Amino acid sequence: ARYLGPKLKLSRREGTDLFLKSGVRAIDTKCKIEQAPGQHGARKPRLSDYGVQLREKQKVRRIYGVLERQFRNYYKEAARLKGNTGENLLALLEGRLDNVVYRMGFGATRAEARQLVSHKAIMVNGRVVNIASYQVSPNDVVSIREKAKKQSRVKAALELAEQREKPTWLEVDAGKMEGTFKRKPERSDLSADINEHLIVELYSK
């Protein structure tokens, strides 16, 4: 139910930096980010039409840490919902509790955030929510509870975030350690490199 292996390998495979490590130390120093994993890394022949789409799908999934069935479900939901499908999917992905936490800066990585969520550190509207897939709504305040507020990791995460660009769709307080999910993010607010359309196509086989 989770990917427990090497994180940088995934990144290498993808091509890009997936942000699977905190960002204290640059990704180029930790691993050969350009070279693909395994014995046959240096060889890089152009991929197929299907293959590129698949890769794209993987990238997105990897980024958020969502396994396949769940991803499929999300896609379906997006399709069902009104408006642009890929965009909807992206929004849904964002909405995940762990992701939100990460954005806020209470977790160094998304993985860390997820862990925190699991371990009953986070509350959503003053009620302890344990599910990483929990879809956080507009105007839903989300905070660290008083037990987990003393942790050194949390402050480190916050610091890291502060170095990292702040998302417009949230509003977080470092002292209070509570952030308000103000609105579901627009496509423009998210990263431009993610070809959602490819993903959509893949499932529209």
């Binding site: 930096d17 990292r164 660009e165 702040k166 998302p167 990263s191 431009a192 490199d193």
Partner: peptide
């Protein structure tokens, strides 16, 4: 963020290495 990217049409840190999306500003690069 205050001024601009050292390299032409490049995020100094890492994204946009072609000529398609000139303007996007990710949180990892500011």
């Amino acid at each position: 963020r205050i001024f601009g990217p050292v390299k032409d049409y490049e995020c100094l840190c890492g994204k946009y290495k072609r000529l398609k999306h000139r303007g996007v500003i990710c949180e990892k690069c500011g």
